[PDB]
Each structure stands twice: as structure tokens, then as C-alpha cells.
Structure 1
Amino acid sequence: AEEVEFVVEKALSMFSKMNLQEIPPLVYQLLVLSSKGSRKSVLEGIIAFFSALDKQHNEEQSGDELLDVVTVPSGELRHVEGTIILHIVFAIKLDYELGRELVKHLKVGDSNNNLSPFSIALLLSVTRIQRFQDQVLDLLKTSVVKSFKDLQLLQGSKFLQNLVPHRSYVSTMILEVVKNSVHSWDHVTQGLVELGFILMDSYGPKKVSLSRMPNQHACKLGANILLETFKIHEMIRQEILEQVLNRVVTRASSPISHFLDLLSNIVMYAPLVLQSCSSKVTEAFDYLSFLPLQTVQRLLKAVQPLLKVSMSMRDCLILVLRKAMFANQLDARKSAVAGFLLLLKNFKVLGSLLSVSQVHVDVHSHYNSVANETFCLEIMDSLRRCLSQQADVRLMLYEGFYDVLRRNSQLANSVMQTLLSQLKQFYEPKPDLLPPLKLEACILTQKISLQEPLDYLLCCIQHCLAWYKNTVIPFYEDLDDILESITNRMIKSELEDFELKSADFSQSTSIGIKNNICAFLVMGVCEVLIEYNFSISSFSKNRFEDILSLFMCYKKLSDILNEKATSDSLLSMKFVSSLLTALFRDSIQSHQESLSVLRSSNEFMRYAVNVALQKVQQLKETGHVSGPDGQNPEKIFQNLCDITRVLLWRYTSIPTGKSISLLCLEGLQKIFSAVQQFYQPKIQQFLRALDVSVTQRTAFQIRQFQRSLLNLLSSQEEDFNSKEALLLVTVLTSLSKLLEPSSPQFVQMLSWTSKICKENSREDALFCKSLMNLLFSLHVSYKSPVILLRDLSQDIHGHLGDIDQDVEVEKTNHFAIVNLRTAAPTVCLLVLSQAEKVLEEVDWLITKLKGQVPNQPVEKAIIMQLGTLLTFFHELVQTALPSGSCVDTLLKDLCKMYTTLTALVRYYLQVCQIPKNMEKLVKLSGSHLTPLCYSFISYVQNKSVATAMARVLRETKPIPNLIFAIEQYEKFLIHLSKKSKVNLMQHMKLSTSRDFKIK
């Protein structure tokens, strides 16, 4: 055993001396020799040599392509690595002990510094052995997740970030394994594809906080792995596309959003897809009829880049979709309607340019515009026949005709005749009969349901007509006449001609359900005509008086339905942005006289702002907006900028159901959250459109909201607008995330929040909780909050008193926000959560530090953190906390405090073959924490169906858990006192025990 150890070790010396091309011959002989001798040292040496060899090559490769000092060229380096990996893999196929050593050597929570691009590529090729397939792939999955947890933990702390020099991450490591796999590493791809699918299956979004972000990163890595492997390796792409389509083409209604983005990215290389894997798309197209409507629309939008460039795929899609049209089975014509709508709103040119002995002939015929127009018109005629189907099918067509009419201008006439004819079925052309529309004809009774979305039909007509009269001009003269007729007759309607103040309006009776459904249609019609009368005749008084009367018709029926007991607004986002701008910040004498009609109605102000809030909320929930151009991120972003400017101006210009200014502040909070969530790269352009860098513009907005909060605080307690103050802090919290922490602007935000917390003593607990959470979020990214935590504990101790009931605790009054009512359970629960974060950071250092063996600077910082956190706990362990969750959380946190102390002692137990600071920390814990923990336990216990048994058996855990933690700590202090020959138990008193004795 010793003799074979020397011969291999001497050969590892030859690794750095012998030529690179000579290594693989040496490895094979030394690997097979390892069968009868040492096994771990053989694999560890090969892995260590190439890990440093690759690292040295990476360092020297970076730089200009001008003359460089390169030892090993990348071409031969990947060749020797690739053939040596195959040598190791072949050895495992005959040994099974070398493979177990490799997994055990590369076992991961710990950073696992032995992981490298060479070792990861070695592990991936090992997965070709079915025995080690699941075992190795589980190792790689755990490594990336832990690596992302480490990355998230470092970025969220400044204390932790200073002490840890940066290290590479497994996610970065695997990506360059894919990059290096181009050099004939075909033995890696199969395990590389399997790992990418495991990462995306195990950590895909299951929507159907702390751990959600690292899970999203692991899923993204799988998509990056699968996408990059698709481009490089031609023989694995057909398996990637087939597996991707398997998770997407289902009726299981499982969350597949991540899979659809990967499929959309793969088909961006359409010629790359058509060359090898094109049948998989065609078989997927065959199942489109059986898929649900939601799946078909999302699947077709994913393979849209493929359809844009390829004629055969469009021909295959049309061929399949045409069958679904003629298919008698329902729920499949719905997918055909979606297929034609998506295909007709995106492509101006459609159409092409068999039996056993039937072949296709390449006819060289020029493209005919007339033939294409006839082809497109025939499809629209097939869509017109679908306006007699279920209300769901009509809804898609109304939403889709506007996009179709904007893409294909030749079909504009077909749309209007199709739309006008449908309106005639419900429009009363008699110039004096009321109501203007036959609301009973839109209802299907068989159970009373809705047959025709008449309000959505009018919305499509109004938008399509508006586009018509401004685009194709440089039926239409009759469409304005009808809409004008509907406008006037709806206003003079007495709200009884609809058979609607309260007849039944119930949710169970048939007539009640019909009235509720009919109530939505008339309100939706009012919204559409409000949009219509705004643009026509420009800013004329008479039309605006008709909007207010139309709104009152909508508002009155909205009130009656709300009080007895919703739906989206039919206004487009562009109109809401345009309406708000004129309604608040338009100053032109011609416009002023007409706009005074709309500005005088306060309820119209509520409606206009609230609809804008609805539009923003749809963006956050869904990612797109309901109205026209509601799935175009560029136009949504432009509308957010204009809406923000109006809401920002209104809130700042005039201070204060809810008032208009409060509504504008509420909308501002949603927009800031929505902009950062979706339009992350447009933040500089978003802040630019409000009237340097992101930090300078953000600070200007931040200081604007800072002054507003100062005015609320400066007022009296009864006048303190709690709702606005919390909403202001939410705005400041979101904006402060944009500042760079290493900047004078960030320091001012931290310095302003600290001053507010130290001087204001509001009685509202929700405001205090939000303000302190802002202070701690800012502070943690600046420095360790242990000093801040220690000062807050002294305030909680001062207000709530001491458990001794015979000594007086002096009131520090470090922060005025920590008053007698907010001290518990608001500040106490808040600081305990922050101290729990501090312990999780320190315990991460010790784990990283212990597994490592700069041991000197990290040890001092850890001891300094635990030394300060001891004083924080020393204050709370002798506070008369209420019997609720404050005691339970402190007991659980004290257990975490002692667990971390034990982990530190066990570290020095491993290293001591004891500095003065560690001496003082052990002495400090035994003089200020341990004796007072026993006093707290006595304090807590003395003062005071099947679920009752559960509650009492749950209450019996926390105190024994702490006693175990203290005794476990003193056990390892005895072990350290023996190894280090210094008695650490002289600092510790004797353990105090309790005896129950019933009265």
C-alpha cells in the first residue's frame, strides 16, 4: 500500500515535467495499475493537474489576440483532456470501485472546491454508465443549487461580501464545459442534455421567496445548457427538440412557461431546426386539435419564428388547421380559429408557391398577388362562418380582427362587412325605439348563458374603424352614423329599457343571472362609446357632455350591481394614457372649455385613474394588457411612461372613497414595481421620460417622496395618514433598490431613513414595521447591523422592563420609532428575524472556513459578530416579553445562537493541534448569556379536543431544544479544553436544573 503510494506520487511529479501528449499514455498505465493499489490518489491527482492546467490556460487566454504567451493551445488541451476522460470512463466500466471513489471524492452544504470544468466534464461522461447515471446527475443538480444559494447569500450582504474573495460558480463552470465540448467531446453531450432537463424539471415554476430566486437560476441554467448544446451538437438536437415538445404538447395544464421560452429560442435557428428535426414539429402540429385552446395559442406563438421563414411549415400548419375547420368535433375548431388568426395577423403572404406513386413536381411559377389575395380572402370567409359559434370563439375573432386588419390592408373591406353584418343582428335601426341594442338577442337560454359579447363586438368595431379612417383613407361613413346613433339613444335611454334599478340581480335565479350578464354588456358598451366620443369631433364640448352622461349611465349601473353583491375595462391602454394626460395636464384655451365638463365630475376622476391602475395590475399579473396593442412591450412601456408622468405630476402638484392623490400614489407604486419586474433594461429610459445615470435620476425621485413623508410625519397623530405613509415607504423601498450601494446617493438614503427612525414616534405598528424593514434592507447592504440590532434590543428592554421585577432598566431611547406599543410584537419579532440572518451568515463562514482546511481575518470578524450578537441576546433574554410568539422566537433564536457557537468551537477543535479573542468570546457567553438563559426559562414557565393536545405537545419542544443546545455547547467546550490544554469551563458556571412541583 505504501509502495504503490510512492510510485504514483512520483509519477504525479512527472505530470508537470513530461510532455502534454505523453500524459494520456501515462494515465492509462497508471490507471490500470491503480486496480491492485490506491484508487483515490490516482483520480485526485489527474483531476488536480488538469484543473490547474485549465485554469492557467484560461488566465493566459484572456487578453488581446495580438501576440500572447500561451503555454498549451486550446486545441490540443481539449484533445488530451477529452481522451483522458474517456480513459477514466472506460476504467470505471470494468472496476466500479474507481467510479465510487470519483463520486465520493467529488461529493458536495459545502463549496466543493474540487469541482472544475475538467471534473464536471468528467462527471458528465461518467453518466453514460447506467449505474452511475442517476447518482452523478443528482450530484450535479445539488452543486448548482448550492452554488446559486452561495451567490445569493453573498450578494445580499456587505459584511459577508468583504470577507470572501470571489470564487467561480458551478453555473459558470458548466457553461464553459458546453463551450469546450465543441472540440469533439461527444461523450459529454448526452449527460449534458440530461442535466439540463433535470434542472428545468426539478426547478421549473410551479405557480399553477428566499428559495424561489435560486430555483429560478437553476432552471435558467438548464435552458442555457439545452440551448447552447442545440447549436453546437447536430446529433443531439433532435432529442432536445423531441423532449422539449413532449413537455409542451400536453393537456395536463402543468406550468410550461419555461419550456415554451426554450422552444422559442431553439426555433430562432430555423434552418438549424429544419435540417435534422422537422418531423417532430409536424407530429406536434397533428395533435393541435386535441390540445386545449390555451396550449394551442401559446405553442403557436413559440414556433412563430420558424413559421416566419419556412413555407413548408406554414403549408403544413394550414393543411392541418384546414382539417380542424372541417372537423365536426368541437373544441378543435377553436384551435383552428386560433391558428388562422395568429397566422393571418402575422403574415401578409400565405400559401404555397400523396399516394404510393404520387410525387410532387417543382413547378417554377412566379408568386401571384391575386392568388394570394383570393387565398387570404377565403380564409376570412371561413372565419366569418365561425361568428355563429360559442361566445368564446366570437371573443377570439373580435380580439383578432384588429390585428388582422392592421397586417393585411387588403382584408380591411372583408373585416368591416363581417363586423357590420354582426352589428346589424343586434342594432335597432329604428331612430326612436329604445334601447339602441337588442340585449335579449345576445343571450342563449337552454341555464342562461351569454351568446354574443356585444360590448366586445363594439370595441373591435370602434378600434378597427378608427384605424380605417386614419390609415387607409390617405360602410365607414355609415359606421360613424350607427355609432353616433347608439351614442345619442343610449344617453336618452331611461335605464329601464334594458329591463334593469333592481329587478332580481341574483346569482342563483335564472332571471337574476340574465340581468347580471346583461348588466356587464351595457356597461361595456358605455365604455366603448366613451372611448369613441373622445376622439371624434376632437375636443368639443357637446361630445364631452355625452361622455359624462354615458359615464353616469355606467356608474349608476355599476353602483346598483356593487351594492346588491369584477370585469376588465374595455378602454385601451393608449386611450387611458391619452385620457389621463388631457384630464390632468392639458392647458390650451380651446381645450379648456370642453374639458371642464369632464374635470368637474369627481367620480369621472376616480374612474379614469382606477382604470389606469387596472391596466398596470394586469401587466404585473399576466405580463400583457387586455386592449389593442396589449401584447407589444414597446407600446406598453411607452404608455407606462405617459401614465407615470401624469400620476407623478398630480401627486406632487397637489397634496392631500380614497382621494385622487392617494390613487395616483398607489398607481406610482405599481408602475415602479412593474417596470423593474418586466422592463429591467429600460430603467434608464423610463426615468429619462420623467420631467446622468440611473442613480442620479432615482435619487431625484427619491428626494421628492422623502419630502412628502416628512409632511405626514410632521402632522399630528390623529391626522397621520397611515395608508399614505405605508404606501410612501413602499415607493421608497422600490426606488432605493435602484441606487448603487457604493455611491453618495445611497448613503443619503440610509442616513435619511436612520434619522426618521430615530426621531419619529408614530403609534401605528404597520408603519413602524415597514420603516424598520426599509432601514434594515438599506443597512445590511452597507455594513453589518449587529450594532444596530444591539441598540434596538436595549430599547425593547427599556420599554418592556426586566424579568427580575426588583432592578430598574434604564431607557436608552436610541430610536423613537421603538415605543411602548411597537416594542412588541413588532420590533422584537423584526430584530429577531434580522439576528437570525446574521447567524445564518456567520454559520456560512464557519462552514466555508472549516471545509477549507485567509483564516486570520475571517476568524476575527466572526468572533466580533458573535461578540456583538451576544449583547443583543443578553438584552432580550432578560426582557419581560409577552407570552406570544416573541418568547417562542427568542427561544428558537437562542438555540440558533448556541448552535453557531458550537460550530465555532468545533472549528477550533479541528484547527487547534486558542487565540485571546476566542478566549473572551467563550468567557463572554458564559457570563452574560448562559446564566441568564436559565433565568429566562424559569421566568417563561412560572408566569402564565384533539387540537388542544396538539398545541400543548407543540409548546413542550422549544425549551428542551435550548437546553440541548447549551449542553451540546458545553460538551464541545470540554473537548476543546482538553485538546488545547486551557480550561474553558472556568468561565462557565454549573448548569442549573429545574424541578416541577405541583401546588
Structure 2
Amino acid sequence: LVDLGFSLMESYEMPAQQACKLGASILLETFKVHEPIRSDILEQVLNRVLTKAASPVSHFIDLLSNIVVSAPLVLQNSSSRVTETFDNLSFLPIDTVQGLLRAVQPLLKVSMSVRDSLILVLQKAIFSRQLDARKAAVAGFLLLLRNFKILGNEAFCLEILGSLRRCLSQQADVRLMLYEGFYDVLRRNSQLASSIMETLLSQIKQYYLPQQDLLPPLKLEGCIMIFLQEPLAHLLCCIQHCLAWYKSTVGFEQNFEEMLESVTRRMIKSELEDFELDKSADFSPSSGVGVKNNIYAIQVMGICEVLIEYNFKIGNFSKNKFEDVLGLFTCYNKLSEILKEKAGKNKSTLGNRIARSFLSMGFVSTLLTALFRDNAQSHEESLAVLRSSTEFMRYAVSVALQKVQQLEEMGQTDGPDGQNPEKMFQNLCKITRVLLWRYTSISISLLCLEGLLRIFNTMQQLYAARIPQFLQALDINVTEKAAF
């Protein structure tokens, strides 16, 4: 049986996918019920995953996770032969390392030796100046922080704080994923969260330019080494999301809110006259200055989008903040609709829509549910003037189309709660109705309908086991509801 499975994974590389499924099934069954050979099975699967990256090899990690969640003691019975696997930081650590650490999480926690090996291997990996090695290091950091839980050994907590702070000085590409992954570990700490906010605040002071509502605080000149050094938009998005988490959880926090508020009040007062990119054609592809304008142009778009989330969330049916949102998108559209996609890149017809957005699936769900299918006395007549901005309407849904497309092509999305399948499932369960309500209220409806096509496509292709609740959530036999 075990030889047949080994050569099954060998012969894989859709009938090939079915062969993978059969091999995983037989290997799991022969591992679960056969005691003295389970160590041999673990050795075989450990020897088979290595030197295998050209073919889709996600099967190795997934069946390994299944067999270790069924029986975690096998690795210790095998004297923890996973230490040698730490060299995989150079072959293909784009997703394999993340899944492998996910699988081995309980055995790293229970076993101190493997934890020590992991921390030392990642410590020597982080300061390797290779892009791939640094990507592997930051990927491992994204998991090790949440490997240990204290939210509900303090030296272990405080010692890990400075590693990512030191790694922050590296390139923008490796500065990227930490902004996204900070929230996941911030959902798992109380005072480590305070230290993380302080570090992020010190980071954002680098480009704040505290000047009290004057010429715009654009220190993008530092992110030029034609090249880019820090993704300001991702940092701002992480700042907003972590601030929201801290506010919901319960000195600098009051300063943190006011400087964020000051920035919002500064963007509304800093238009495309104080900006350096006031020319309609300063952009030039394959030029040393044009691409510098292009990266400045794309970066500020993410800057505007983040504060749209802030003002909408920090204000609660308060007309003063709603007009701020209007001004932010006014700056956004005035600089995104034209200049870019006129001189930036529109020579080929844009198949996609408004550029990669840095919003929250939770936020866009709240926005659409509050915008459409919501009419109460708590509404302060702000949506009435907000509804006049039909350009904001098109963007308000096109971002959602971008997010679920990420769930279409890939298995995840951006923003908080991008990896908890039930979480977007509830989000998808909620946004679909108002998406349908907007279509049935009576282009703009063309956008929401296109989304529904991609919810149903994603529902069947990804959440196949979760179809009955989604079908019933539109208000058990699926056909009667489907026929409806």
C-alpha cells in the first residue's frame, strides 16, 4: 500500500488530480490504522516532499497536516526528523513554508527542541540579503508569533518584539507582507500589541512631517531608491486596521488618533496644486523620472483609500466625516480617473477596473449594507449627498469585485480576516443580498450583477461543502431554494 502511494505521488507529475486525491486518501488510511509502519509513512512523505517544486506539490503539505492532526506524536516517535526540512527556504518558500509551519504548529509548541531549531534557522535566515531568503524569513515570522499564545514565559513575549522592527529597515518588497500579517498576531496579544503600535507609530513618524495643516506631507522622495523603498499605502492600511482593533479591544494613542485625524484634514486641504504631480503628462514609461511619478501616483491612491476606511469607521452617522470621505474620493478620482489611465497606463484597454484596493472585506460589507438596504432615523442625511457621487458608487462596488476576484483566482484576499474561510463566508452571505437588492432596486447594477456571478462561481469552486447555509442565507433541500 505505501509503495503504491509513493509511486502514485511520483506518477502524478483531471485524472492526475484524482490520482493525487486517491493517493492522499490511501496514505492517510494506512497511516491512521497501521501502528508500526506510520513512522515509515512519515519518513516516506518527508523524503518525497523535498526536491519537488515544478509540479503542484500542495498535496504533500495537506496530507501531512491531516496525518499530524490525526496523530501528532508520530514526529516525536520519528525523533523529530523535521529539523532537516528547514533548508527549504531556498527551493520554493512562497506557500510551502507557510503550510508546513501550519501543519507542524502543535508539535513545535509541545516540543522545545524543534522550536529552538526553528528560531535559530529563522534568525540566521533573516539577515541573509537574498530576496527569497528574506521572504522565507518573514513568512516564518508571520507564523511563529501566533505559534505561542498568552492572550488568556514573558521573556519569550518581549524578546521577539525587536526582530520585525529590525527587519523593517529592508526593502519595500520585504516590507510588504509584515503590514498585512501584523493584524493576525495583533489579534493575539495585549501589551505586545502596545509595543507593536509604538513601533509602527515611530515608523510612520518618518514620513509624517508634523506641520499642522499646511503643504502636503509627501516624503515620497525617500521611496525612490525608479525604485520604491517603503509601501506607504500598506503601512497606512495596517495602521488603520490595528487602530480599529485596539479601539475595539477596550498616551500615544491619543496622539495616534489626532495625527491620523490631522492627515485626513490635511488631504482635504491639499489638492492637486500643492502636489508635485500637477502636470497631466509628467509620467513617462521607460524613463528615470516618469516611473518615479508613477510610483508616487500609485502610492497616494492607496493613501486616500485607507483614510476612507478611517473616517467611515471613526465617525458614526456624523455628517462632518462623510464630507471628508467625499473629499478623499474627490482627490482620489481627480487623480486616478485622469493622469493615470490617460498617460500612466491605458494604451491597452483595461480589462480590470479601479486599481488594487487596500480596503477591508468587513468595511466594504458595512459600507454597502449601510449605503443600500438601510434607511433609518440614525441616517443623518449624509448618504443623501453621498448618493449624488455616482463615481463613488462605481468605485464602492468595484473594490468588492476586486476582492472576490482575489477569492476567484486565488484562495485568499486582502484586509483583515482574509484566511478564515467562515469569516468571508459570512461576509459573502451578507454582501450578496444587498448586491441582489441593488440589482432588484430598479452602469452601476452591471457591477453588482457581475459580482453575483463571481460569488456563485466562488461558492461552488471553493465553498462546496458550505453551500447549504449560503443557499439558505439568501432568505433542507438545495434544489427548491436553487430553483427559487
State whether TM-score is above 0.5.
yes
Map 1:729-768 onto structure 2 (within 5 A).
none
Q: 1:534 to 1:235 in 2, by over 3 A?
A: same
Offset at residue 326 of structure 1 (A): 5.6
Q: Which residue of 2 aligns with 1:241?
A: 42
Deviation (angstroms), 1:554: 1.4
Partner of 1:219: 20
Gaps of 5+ in 2: 346-351
Alignment match, 1:433: 214
Post-superposition offset of 1:393: 2.1
Return the match for 2:397 from 604, 609, 612: 609
Kindly provide the CA deviation profile for residues 188-245 of structure 1, in whole angstroms up to 9, marking residues without a partner as x: xxxx1222233334336xxxxxxx2x43222201000111112233444344333433
Instruction: Please name the residue that 1:160 is paired with.
Output: none
The letter of the residue matching 1:562 is E
Give the structure 2 partner of residue 685 of structure 1.
469
Instruction: Assess if the C-alpha contact under 8 Å between 1:373 and 1:410 holds in 2.
Output: no
Q: Which structure 2 residues correspond to residues 495-510 of structure 1 after superposition, within 5 A? A: 495-500=272-277, 501-510=279-288
Please say if 1:200 is aligned against 2:3: no
Q: What is the one-letter code of the residue matched to 1:383?
A: L
1:563 aligns with 2:342: yes
Change (3 A) 1:587 1:349: closer
Gaps of 5+ in 1: 1-191, 205-211, 351-368, 701-999
Shift of 1:292: 4.2
Q: Distance in 1 between matches of 2:40 and 2:282?
A: 60
What code does the residue aligned with 1:517 have? Answer: I
Aligned to 2:349: none
- Tell me which residue corresponds to 1:421: 202
Q: Deviations over 1:906-925 (max 9, x none)?
A: xxxxxxxxxxxxxxxxxxxx
- Contact in 2 for aligned 1:377/1:414 (Cα 8 Å): no
1:713-745 Cα deviation digits (max 9, x unpaired): xxxxxxxxxxxxxxxxxxxxxxxxxxxxxxxxx
Work out whether residues 289 and 335 of structure 1, in 8 Å CA contact, stay in contact via their aligned partners in 2: yes
Q: For the pair shown, which has the larger CA radius of gyration, 1 or 2?
A: 1
For 2:427, the equivalent position in structure 1 comes to 639
Report if aligned partners of 2:65, 2:100 keep a CA contact under 8 Å in 1. Answer: no
Any conservation in 1 of the 2:180–2:238 contact (CA below 8 Å)? yes
- In the TM superposition, what is the alpha-carbon distance from 1:644 to its structure 2 partner? 0.3
Shift in CA distance, 504/573, structure 1 to aligned 2, threshold 3 Å: same
TM-score by length of 1: 0.45
Which residue of the other structure, out of 371, 386, 391, is the alignment partner of 2:167?
Answer: 386
Give distance in 1, aligned partners of 2:275 and 2:216. Answer: 6
Per-residue deviation, residues 502-533 of structure 1 (Å, max 9, x unmatched): 24322200111111111111000111000000
Question: Does the 8 Å contact 1:394/1:453 carry over to 2?
Answer: yes
Describe how 1:245-644 pairs up with structure 2 within 5 A.
Answer: 245-250=46-51, 252-285=53-86, 287-294=87-94, 295-325=96-126, 331-348=132-149, 372-444=153-225, 448-472=226-250, 475-500=252-277, 501-559=279-337, 560-564=339-343, 565=345, 567-644=355-432
Deviations 1:143-182 (A, max 9, x none): xxxxxxxxxxxxxxxxxxxxxxxxxxxxxxxxxxxxxxxx
Superposed CA deviations along residues 463-513 of structure 1, whole A, max 9, x for unmatched, are 00111011139x111111111111111122122434224243222001111
Q: Which amino acid aligns with 1:382?
A: S
CA distance in 2, matches of 1:278, 1:643: 49
What is the CA–CA distance in structure 2 between the aligned matches of 1:395 and 1:382, rounded to whole Å? 16
1:416 is displaced (CA, Å) by 0.8
TM alignment of 1:932-971, pairs within 5 A:
none
CA 1:401 to 1:438, structure 2 compared with 1: closer, same or farther past 3 Å?
same
- The equivalences for 1:652-801 within 5 A come to 652-654=440-442, 659-700=443-484
**Alignment CA distance shift 1:508-1:399 (3 Å):** same
SS of the residue corresponding to residue 407 of structure 1 reads: coil
Instruction: Report the CA distance between 1:435 and its aligned residue.
Output: 1.4
- Mapping 1:99-118, distance limit 5 Å: none
> 1:251 touches 1:292 (CA, 8 Å); kept in 2?
no
SS at 2:69's partner residue?
A: coil
Residues 599-625 of structure 1 deviation map (CA, whole Å, 9 limit, x = unaligned): 111111111111111111111111111
CA distance in 2, matches of 1:271, 1:228: 15
Q: Once structures 1 and 2 are overlaid, which stretch shifts more, 393-402 or 455-464?
A: 393-402
Q: How far apart are residue 321 of structure 1 and its match?
A: 2.1
Letter of the structure 1 residue corresponding to residue 11 of structure 2: S
Which AA in structure 1 matches 2:449? L
Secondary structure class of the residue paired with 2:168: helix
TM-superposed deviation, 1:253? 4.7
Q: 1:512 to 1:697 in 2, by over 3 A?
A: same
How do residues 14-53 of structure 1 correspond to structure 2 at under 5 angstroms? none
Greater relative contact order (CA < 8 Å, ≥ 6 in sequence): 2
Is the Cα–Cα contact under 8 Å of residues 583 and 595 in structure 1 kept in the other structure?
yes
Using the alignment, how far apart are the partners of 2:470 and 2:59 within structure 1?
Answer: 27
For 1:550 and 1:246, the matched residues in 2 are separated by 55
2: CA distance between counterparts of 1:582 and 1:683?
26
Counterpart Cα distance in 1 of 2:287 and 2:99? 37
SS in 2 for 1:280: coil
**Structure 2 vs 1, CA of residues 379 and 291 (structure 1 numbering), >3 Å: closer, same or farther?**
farther
Residue identity matched to 1:674: T
Deviation at 1:591, TM superposition (A): 1.0
Does the C-alpha gap of structure 1 residues 333 and 662 become closer, same or farther in structure 2, counting only changes over 3 Å? closer
Partners of 1:514 and 1:292 lie apart in 2 by 31
8 Å CA contact 2:126, 2:167 repeated in 1? no
Deviation per residue, 1:789-827 (Å, 9 max, x gap): xxxxxxxxxxxxxxxxxxxxxxxxxxxxxxxxxxxxxxx
Aligned AA for 1:302? Answer: A
Whether contact under 8 Å (1:270, 1:309) holds in the other structure is no
User: CA, structure 1 residues 278+431, in 2 after alignment: closer, same or farther (shift >3 Å)?
Assistant: same
Letter in 2 for 1:618: Q
**More displaced, 276-285 or 610-619?**
276-285
Deviation at residue 694 of structure 1 after TM alignment: 1.5
668-677 or 250-259, which moves further after superposition? 250-259
SS of structure 2 residue aligned to 1:458: helix
Indicate conservation of the 8 Å contact 1:200/1:220, yes or no. no
* TM-align CA RMSD: 2.3
Over residues 549-588 of structure 1, what are the superposed CA-to-partner deviations in whole Å (9 max), with x where a residue is unaligned? 1112112222221122274210010101111111111111
One-letter code of the match for 2:23? Answer: G
Q: Measure, in 2, the Cα distance between the counterparts of 1:381 and 1:431.
A: 31
What are the Cα deviations for residues 311-354 of structure 1, in whole angstroms up to 9, with x where unaligned?
4432332232233346576643443332222110342259xxxx
Task: Please list, as runs of the form range in 1=range in 2, the aligned pairs for 1:835-846 lying within 5 A after superposition.
Answer: none
How far 1:431 moved relative to its partner? Answer: 1.3
Whichever residue aligns with residue 495 of structure 1, its letter is: L
| Pair 415,251 (structure 1): closer, same or farther in 2 beyond 3 Å | farther
> Using the alignment, how far apart are the partners of 2:409 and 2:79 within structure 1?
35
> Which amino acid is the alignment partner of residue 392 of structure 1?
D
Separation in structure 2 between the aligned mates of residue 499 and residue 424 of structure 1, nearest angstrom: 21
How far apart, CA to CA, are the structure 1 residues paired with 2:67 and 2:44? 12
Q: In 2, Cα distance between the equivalents of 1:592 and 1:646?
A: 21
1:522 match: secondary structure:
helix
Offset from partner CA, 1:620-652 (integer Å, 9 cap, x none): 111111111101101010100111011111112
Q: Contact 2:42–2:75 (CA<8 Å) still a contact in 1?
A: no
| Cα shift at 1:305 | 4.2
Counterparts in 2 of 1:525 and 1:250: CA distance versus 1, 3 Å = farther
Cα distance change, pair 694–563 in 1 and its aligned pair in 2 (3 A): same
Once residues 129 and 388 of structure 2 are traced to their aligned partners in structure 1, the CA distance between those partners, rounded to angstroms, is: 56
Across the two proteins, how many residue pairs are aligned to each other?
472
